[PDB]
Amino acid sequence: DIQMTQSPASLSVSVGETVTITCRASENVYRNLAWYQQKQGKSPQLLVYAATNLADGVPSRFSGSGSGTQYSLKINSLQSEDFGSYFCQHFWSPVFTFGAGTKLELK
Amino acid sequence: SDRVRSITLGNSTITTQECANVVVGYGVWPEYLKDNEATAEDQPTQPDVATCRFYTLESVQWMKNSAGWWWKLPDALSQMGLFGQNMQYHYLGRTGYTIHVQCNASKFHQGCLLVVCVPEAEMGCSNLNNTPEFSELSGGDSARMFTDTQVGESNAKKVQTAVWNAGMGVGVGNLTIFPHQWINLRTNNSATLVMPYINSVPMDNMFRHNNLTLMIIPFVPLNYSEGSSPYVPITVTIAPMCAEYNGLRLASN
Amino acid sequence: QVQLKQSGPGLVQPSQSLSITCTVSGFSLTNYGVHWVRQSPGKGLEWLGVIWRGGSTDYNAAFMSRLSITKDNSKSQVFFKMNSLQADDTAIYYCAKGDYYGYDAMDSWGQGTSVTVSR
Amino acid sequence: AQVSTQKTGIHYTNINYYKDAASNSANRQDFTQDPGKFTEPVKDIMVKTMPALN
Amino acid sequence: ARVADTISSRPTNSESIPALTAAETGHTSQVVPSDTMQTRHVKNYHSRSESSIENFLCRSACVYYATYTNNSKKGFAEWVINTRQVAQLRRKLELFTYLRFDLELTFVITSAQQPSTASSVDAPVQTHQIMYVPPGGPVPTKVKDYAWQTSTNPSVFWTEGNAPPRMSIPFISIGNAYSCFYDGWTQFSRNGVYGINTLNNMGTLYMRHVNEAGQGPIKSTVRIYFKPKHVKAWVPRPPRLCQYEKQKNVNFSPIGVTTSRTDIITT
Amino acid sequence: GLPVMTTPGSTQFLTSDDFQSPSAMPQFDVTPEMQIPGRVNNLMEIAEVDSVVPVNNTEDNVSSLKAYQIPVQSNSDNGKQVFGFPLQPGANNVLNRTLLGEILNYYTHWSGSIKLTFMFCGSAMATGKFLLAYSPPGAGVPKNRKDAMLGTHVIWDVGLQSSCVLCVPWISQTHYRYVVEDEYTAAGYVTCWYQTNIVVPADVQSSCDILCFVSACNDFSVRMLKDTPFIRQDTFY
Ligand SMILES: CCCCCCCCCCCCCCCC(=O)O
């Protein structure tokens, strides 16, 4: 079908640092992309949809950029509420495929 | 002062303090069916106050990255009072409409909405071998929303809701050939359209055919600075005009 | 408004069918569809199926035959069934609604029901 | 027999030979224009020299 | 049909504001160039004659072509009548929602010789039959059939080497106008066929050879031409931007509204 | 037997001939005619309706609603250009797909004046003044506001009436112009310049937008009908 490659696997940043997480697809998904955040042992939360748009309660530190087969998320200033797992998912056509995952450290 | 209007229909009244002119269809006011154009031979029903009044749908929220909404017009009023009750017991019906789209914001907001009214807006599917299903063509007085991206094919027979083709395969800037108004937040507060009955037959079944479609599309996106109110709704209020029904039998649906 | 939640058997024997029921609230099933996602420890997140707002389904190609999802709009409840339950099915199952402003993305998720397929 | 005007920058004649009115020639000289139902589909008439809103 | 002419104007300094308007009213400005600049008097002898609907639409356009071979028992052609298989006439009729016209029908029939094996093929002149069956009648199943007796169905015979056959058709419909677009279903339960295919019921056209297969196969091709007369049209519609994909519906794949240029001030 | 003599042009099929033909269904009773609203008699009734012009193609906005939005900011200089395009209403890719330009691509010749309406879709607390210019050919496209003010221009003051019309007059050597691209019948250029700046108060966004509409005047006409290049086919549907 179509597989979403998420890079990198893990990161180590600090509060106030800019984080860039990218995703790559096998073929074009036409900006039919979503981003999720998962905290410790809970349900995921929708964060960025349609490859640019932000969700309902999501603050303006997150930013979605990409078109075609290359996509990226940017976090401008880190806080204590932002560490955890980040996935990317396409909803272009079945079968829908999630990303591998990217975890943040905040050392 | 051309800036104020007042529309009275039945037991309901619309008051507007800031508006443009009123657009009347193709220059035709809605009226009843004449004797030389009628086909069915039995006497039609004319409720005249229980149906010809203002009904208000649900409200949608205008966002900074919103794409657009649409409604199917003799389908959003299918559970609305005694207008929806006469549709279920009768087989034929003809109706003109008065549409009032309303959206208020301050002098510190900006944006621009196009409010068109399209007759026989036949739409397309994402899977090219199929046709769209009913549930995705129309909701019960709830807006179906355009997308800023291109929709892919699936087992749901969805509508191709890329907003720049308007779901019909045309140019969205050429949508001003239909009766339309604009809502510019700099100068305008509401829009009013009076539509007559448009069909190729004098009466038609009001459940198997939607002969009007109301689209609202933001050409200039909503924008404000920090401190202004972030929640801006859009409310649609539709009134039937000169509605008559024919062919009374048991209740469908 | 408030949102959905689910209920589950918890843990059953191998080669036994599973039934988890998601009950929705705050919205109607005629306007939105329900997705079924599986958070695995070894395989991450994976999408099992969807029941669309019209009533048609779509299933994963790996799990096509064993999986079946139905719903009833009046009771506002969704029922799905999976069969033959091998050892790799030990994961956390979620029900989540889509059609987030027409954009087919998962809006709000359930609380999850972690299952274990061992004896 | 009908005698008409023959579009130019002189007359011509015409006789119908069949019994059905769907058998005739094309019209081609019916020149009517009413753009006011598309360009000015408003309720209150707007004067060109006056401001649109007051 | 003459266009409006130009009036002379003088320098103005007043409170009249023809240039300033409000486009939110749904109203096009009725301004002429003699309101914003100084013009001269110009007599216009231009005419709007060639842009009427009786001039724009009344031209013959190919709608179909079918093929049938002589030396076969199933060697006849069949076509369900519609106007949605060619791209040029479909885009012209779909500038309007409702249309009402009489029709002129023209057939262009040619033939070609197929690779036989007999010596000294000398073929006579070929004669064809085109039969129209309204919806509900009997349909032919082979070439030598009883159904070609055409007691009540209209048909036409034509011999090769002459003028093409031509006949007129009145406004045949059950409604008051032809519909190019239909936003509805054929069933009251809102299932099954959605769109313009529910209103399309016009009949079927049948074509065959009247001669017998003499000594070699002959493969013929008939082309069909539509020409609307006495046209009336209502509710104009934007032109088709995307490309057509199917016949039964208006499905498409999205495309940009124009083509690109490199900068907003690029001339 | 009246002696006749057949002329050249017999037994031919010209696709635009005007003759009578026998009917296939004699004495057919058609359905009576109804009064449907919105009857079109002339294609020029369509071309006098405003249509939104995508001035902002820029190779990334064509599959979006951003193509119809003209960006307008608050500057630190003066005399800047807003947009600019040549006046080729059926050959230039800005006006090619508008409702005026889609009728022009069915015809070969055109003649008449052209309306251009600009709407200011900004905040009600913002002001500004613009120069809307049109220059006939013979020179190049104007590079400055000083070169652009020598032609036909209107100065637009943004206020409560949020629209202004720049009426392009018919200035040609011939009676008609070709719809296709031709250097013999060029028509000129339409540019836009900052007259003053966009002055905006606090807590209001500095960036605004402008919509643009095109239509035809009542002296517009077309000629020599042809087939459009905006549709293709390989096989039947
Ligand atoms: C030899 C006999 C020939 C008779 C052929 C009759 C052909 C009928 C054509 C019907 C016209 C259809 C017009 C288009 C209708 C639509 O737009 O849906």
Side-chain angles (χ1 to χ4, degrees):
Chain A
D1 40 1
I2 167 164
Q3 328 289 336
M4 314 296 304
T5 296
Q6 193 155 352
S7 178
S10 62
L11 286 170
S12 65
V13 288
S14 56
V15 169
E17 187 73 29
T18 61
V19 175
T20 290
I21 308 167
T22 191
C23 275
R24 209 191 78 230
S26 297
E27 62 183 0
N28 194 5
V29 298
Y30 299 87
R31 298 185 325 274
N32 283 276
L33 198 86
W35 292 95
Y36 302 98
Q37 170 185 131
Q38 204 171 20
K39 288 179 175 296
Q40 290 270 45
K42 294 188 288 290
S43 282
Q45 290 281 278
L46 177 64
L47 192 132
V48 161
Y49 71 105
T52 54
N53 305 340
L54 258 65
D56 187 75
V58 160
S60 162
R61 302 155 310 165
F62 302 95
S63 177
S65 298
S67 295
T69 48
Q70 185 70 43
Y71 298 92
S72 180
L73 201 147
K74 285 171 66 182
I75 306 100
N76 297 115
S77 180
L78 264 290
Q79 266 79 13
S80 298
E81 64 183 1
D82 297 334
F83 72 101
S85 298
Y86 292 93
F87 306 95
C88 68
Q89 186 215 6
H90 80 92
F91 43 83
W92 161 249
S93 293
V95 183
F96 301 153
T97 303
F98 283 83
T102 296
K103 211 191 285 183
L104 263 63
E105 177 66 29
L106 306 189
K107 41 153 70 164
Chain B
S1 168
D2 205 47
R3 217 69 85 95
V4 289
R5 299 283 288 187
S6 197
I7 312 172
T8 295
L9 265 178
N11 53 0
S12 62
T13 317
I14 292 288
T15 298
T16 306
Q17 298 219 49
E18 171 181 347
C19 56
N21 216 335
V22 172
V23 160
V24 185
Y26 288 92
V28 188
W29 204 267
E31 289 179 353
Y32 283 120
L33 188 55
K34 301 276 196 173
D35 280 330
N36 45 307
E37 289 180 351
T39 296
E41 296 171 355
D42 48 346
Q43 200 170 138
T45 318
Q46 276 144 20
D48 205 4
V49 288
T51 54
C52 310
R53 53 174 318 272
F54 279 105
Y55 302 97
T56 314
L57 315 177
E58 285 164 40
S59 293
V60 304
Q61 186 202 348
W62 191 2
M63 294 174 178
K64 284 192 173 182
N65 45 15
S66 161
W69 314 261
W70 85 85
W71 291 267
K72 296 287 193 193
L73 191 52
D75 177 82
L77 312 171
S78 49
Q79 284 90 16
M80 282 295 197
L82 279 162
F83 185 82
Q85 290 299 307
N86 275 271
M87 288 176 52
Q88 299 181 36
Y89 281 92
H90 288 93
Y91 160 63
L92 297 161
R94 88 198 289 272
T95 307
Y97 296 107
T98 307
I99 306 157
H100 191 67
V101 177
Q102 52 194 355
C103 184
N104 57 272
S106 59
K107 297 199 181 72
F108 277 52
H109 292 70
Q110 39 174 289
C112 199
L113 296 153
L114 171 70
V115 188
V116 293
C117 191
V118 185
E120 315 272 3
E122 185 188 341
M123 289 174 155
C125 189
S126 298
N127 180 225
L128 290 161
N129 310 275
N130 300 342
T131 58
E133 289 180 352
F134 167 68
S135 62
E136 290 165 349
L137 277 157
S138 179
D141 68 273
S142 297
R144 294 283 178 260
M145 304 174 182
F146 286 111
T147 60
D148 192 21
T149 187
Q150 168 173 358
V151 170
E153 78 177 52
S154 68
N155 219 26
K157 293 135 82 179
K158 295 178 183 182
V159 189
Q160 187 54 250
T161 42
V163 67
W164 59 95
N165 285 121
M168 294 183 289
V170 288
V172 73
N174 302 0
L175 267 183
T176 61
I177 197 174
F178 300 114
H180 72 285
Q181 286 223 340
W182 298 87
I183 302 189
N184 199 9
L185 287 191
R186 169 183 188 87
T187 172
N188 224 30
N189 198 5
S190 71
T192 313
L193 312 171
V194 184
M195 298 294 307
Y197 179 75
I198 293 167
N199 209 340
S200 66
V201 285
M203 275 196 146
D204 198 75
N205 186 248
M206 301 181 103
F207 269 112
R208 65 194 301 201
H209 183 218
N210 315 282
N211 42 3
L212 266 193
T213 297
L214 181 70
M215 303 167 176
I216 302 176
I217 290 152
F219 261 85
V220 168
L222 183 68
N223 210 13
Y224 51 89
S225 182
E226 291 294 325
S228 307
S229 294
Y231 205 98
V232 174
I234 301 166
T235 305
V236 182
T237 307
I238 310 146
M241 291 188 81
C242 283
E244 55 196 328
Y245 312 94
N246 217 350
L248 178 81
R249 79 286 182 276
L250 77 160
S252 66
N253 288 68
Chain C
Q1 289 276 273
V2 293
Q3 290 315 300
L4 51 90
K5 70 190 57 175
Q6 62 206 273
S7 46
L11 60 92
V12 291
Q13 295 91 20
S15 181
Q16 287 300 104
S17 190
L18 182 54
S19 173
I20 317 172
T21 297
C22 202
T23 297
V24 312
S25 179
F27 66 99
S28 68
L29 281 183
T30 59
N31 292 282
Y32 299 94
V34 181
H35 292 253
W36 290 99
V37 187
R38 185 170 85 184
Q39 172 90 63
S40 182
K43 296 183 289 294
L45 283 159
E46 52 200 359
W47 171 84
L48 297 166
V50 64
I51 170 74
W52 294 113
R53 92 180 93 189
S56 45
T57 46
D58 218 334
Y59 299 109
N60 204 324
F63 318 103
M64 187 181 290
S65 46
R66 331 199 296 265
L67 186 60
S68 309
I69 316 163
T70 76
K71 75 184 168 75
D72 182 86
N73 311 271
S74 173
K75 64 176 72 174
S76 295
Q77 290 176 356
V78 190
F79 306 90
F80 88 104
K81 184 178 290 294
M82 189 180 289
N83 301 272
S84 295
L85 202 65
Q86 292 295 320
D88 53 353
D89 294 8
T90 303
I92 304 107
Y93 288 74
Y94 299 103
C95 49
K97 58 172 292 286
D99 294 307
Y100 184 73
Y101 303 126
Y103 274 109
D104 216 1
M106 272 77 84
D107 185 11
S108 76
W109 294 61
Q111 84 269 9
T113 47
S114 176
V115 311
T116 312
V117 311
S118 191
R119 182 64 186 88
Chain D
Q2 315 102 30
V3 192
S4 199
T5 182
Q6 201 173 60
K7 163 71 175 282
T8 180
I10 307 99
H11 295 119
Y12 79 100
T13 191
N14 175 80
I15 303 183
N16 300 316
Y17 309 114
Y18 303 101
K19 295 189 190 172
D20 313 296
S23 306
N24 301 337
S25 293
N27 288 137
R28 296 290 182 91
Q29 309 199 241
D30 294 26
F31 300 137
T32 300
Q33 285 142 59
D34 179 28
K37 64 157 81 84
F38 307 113
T39 51
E40 316 162 300
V42 295
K43 195 170 176 304
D44 307 303
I45 296 97
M46 309 163 90
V47 195
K48 188 210 305 183
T49 55
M50 293 181 72
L53 313 182
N54 205 54
Chain E
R2 264 184 216 215
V3 300
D5 52 329
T6 317
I7 318 298
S8 186
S9 52
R10 276 178 173 170
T12 62
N13 198 337
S14 48
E15 290 86 5
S16 296
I17 36 161
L20 298 169
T21 177
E24 305 85 11
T25 60
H27 179 263
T28 313
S29 52
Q30 302 305 294
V31 289
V32 285
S34 65
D35 308 331
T36 47
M37 56 196 300
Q38 285 184 246
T39 62
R40 69 167 294 172
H41 181 247
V42 170
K43 293 179 179 179
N44 284 115
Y45 303 115
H46 293 183
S47 179
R48 285 187 161 173
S49 59
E50 201 173 1
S51 71
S52 52
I53 60 168
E54 192 69 26
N55 281 253
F56 174 62
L57 283 174
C58 190
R59 291 216 172 174
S60 312
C62 198
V63 291
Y64 198 55
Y65 67 91
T67 322
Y68 51 96
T69 306
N70 210 338
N71 213 303
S72 169
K73 193 173 182 178
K74 299 296 293 297
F76 64 100
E78 179 212 11
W79 181 52
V80 185
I81 299 171
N82 73 309
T83 44
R84 282 173 220 101
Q85 285 187 350
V86 289
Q88 291 188 26
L89 190 46
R90 193 186 182 172
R91 207 189 178 270
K92 276 183 60 168
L93 297 156
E94 285 171 355
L95 304 177
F96 320 97
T97 317
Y98 307 104
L99 280 149
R100 177 181 178 111
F101 47 85
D102 309 306
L103 200 76
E104 204 162 55
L105 194 44
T106 309
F107 302 100
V108 174
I109 314 164
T110 59
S111 295
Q113 184 209 344
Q114 299 302 125
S116 166
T117 196
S119 177
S120 178
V121 173
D122 181 65
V125 64
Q126 292 311 298
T127 308
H128 307 260
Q129 190 197 346
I130 304 171
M131 187 194 198
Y132 168 60
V133 174
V139 287
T141 58
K142 60 196 178 85
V143 183
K144 188 173 73 67
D145 205 77
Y146 86 106
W148 306 92
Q149 274 173 16
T150 175
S151 164
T152 312
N153 298 152
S155 68
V156 61
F157 295 85
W158 177 80
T159 309
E160 288 213 13
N162 297 125
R166 195 202 279 262
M167 77 289 306
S168 293
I169 294 97
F171 174 71
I172 45 153
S173 191
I174 67 160
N176 294 264
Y178 290 123
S179 316
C180 297
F181 299 93
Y182 184 60
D183 191 27
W185 297 265
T186 189
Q187 293 176 5
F188 300 92
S189 66
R190 299 204 216 87
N191 279 322
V193 185
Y194 163 77
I196 202 57
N197 198 60
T198 73
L199 298 190
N200 176 226
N201 214 4
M202 289 293 158
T204 309
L205 211 71
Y206 285 97
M207 280 80 69
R208 71 153 173 175
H209 288 103
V210 194
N211 291 29
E212 299 202 331
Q215 269 286 283
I218 282 165
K219 170 171 145 190
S220 300
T221 308
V222 48
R223 289 171 196 259
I224 311 161
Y225 288 87
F226 268 29
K227 181 172 175 313
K229 322 177 303 188
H230 316 124
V231 198
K232 297 152 193 311
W234 303 267
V235 191
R237 181 67 63 98
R240 175 78 174 201
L241 171 70
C242 297
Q243 298 291 322
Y244 291 114
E245 317 271 340
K246 310 279 176 173
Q247 169 205 353
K248 304 292 181 68
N249 43 16
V250 288
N251 294 7
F252 63 98
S253 44
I255 208 61
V257 286
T258 51
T259 44
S260 300
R261 64 169 175 164
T262 183
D263 183 41
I264 197 167
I265 76 182
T266 287
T267 63
Chain F
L2 178 73
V4 301
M5 202 200 66
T6 74
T7 56
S10 292
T11 74
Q12 65 156 12
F13 175 42
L14 181 65
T15 63
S16 64
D17 55 3
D18 196 9
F19 300 130
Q20 319 190 32
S21 306
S23 186
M25 305 161 199
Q27 304 292 319
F28 190 80
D29 197 50
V30 302
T31 56
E33 187 178 359
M34 210 171 60
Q35 274 291 325
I36 314 176
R39 185 167 157 175
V40 197
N41 301 272
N42 203 317
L43 274 178
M44 306 318 291
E45 312 176 20
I46 296 173
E48 303 185 69
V49 188
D50 289 332
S51 190
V52 188
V53 180
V55 194
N56 201 26
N57 309 132
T58 72
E59 72 263 2
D60 287 326
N61 299 327
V62 283
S63 294
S64 67
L65 272 181
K66 266 209 156 199
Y68 309 99
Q69 300 161 16
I70 310 177
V72 160
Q73 315 92 14
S74 62
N75 306 117
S76 295
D77 45 354
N78 39 11
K80 267 190 54 57
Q81 203 187 354
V82 181
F83 56 87
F85 48 91
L87 194 79
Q88 304 152 353
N92 180 39
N93 49 5
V94 182
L95 301 162
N96 218 4
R97 305 310 298 255
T98 48
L99 201 65
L100 171 66
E102 291 259 35
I103 293 172
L104 287 198
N105 281 267
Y106 276 117
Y107 293 92
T108 315
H109 311 129
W110 70 277
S111 178
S113 299
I114 277 176
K115 267 177 275 202
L116 269 171
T117 318
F118 307 95
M119 189 159 66
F120 183 73
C121 299
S123 179
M125 303 288 306
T127 59
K129 281 167 197 204
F130 300 97
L131 181 77
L132 307 155
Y134 164 67
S135 75
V141 56
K143 304 277 191 60
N144 319 315
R145 196 171 46 133
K146 191 140 293 197
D147 291 334
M149 74 153 187
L150 300 165
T152 298
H153 60 100
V154 194
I155 287 180
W156 175 25
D157 182 36
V158 170
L160 318 173
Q161 309 279 278
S162 47
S163 296
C164 204
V165 182
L166 166 78
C167 201
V168 178
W170 179 252
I171 304 162
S172 177
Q173 61 181 358
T174 53
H175 275 288
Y176 289 88
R177 276 194 183 115
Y178 288 114
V179 172
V180 76
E181 177 72 80
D182 194 4
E183 194 176 2
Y184 180 65
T185 67
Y189 307 92
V190 169
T191 57
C192 185
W193 304 83
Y194 281 90
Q195 180 91 7
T196 71
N197 206 25
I198 299 276
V199 195
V200 69
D203 308 315
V204 192
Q205 287 280 342
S206 298
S207 296
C208 300
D209 268 2
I210 286 184
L211 292 191
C212 170
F213 311 91
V214 74
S215 67
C217 283
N218 49 346
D219 51 285
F220 210 98
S221 59
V222 285
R223 223 173 65 164
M224 206 176 199
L225 176 79
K226 65 168 181 57
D227 294 335
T228 186
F230 291 143
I231 207 78
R232 281 90 166 90
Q233 212 174 355
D234 285 329
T235 185
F236 284 131
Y237 305 135

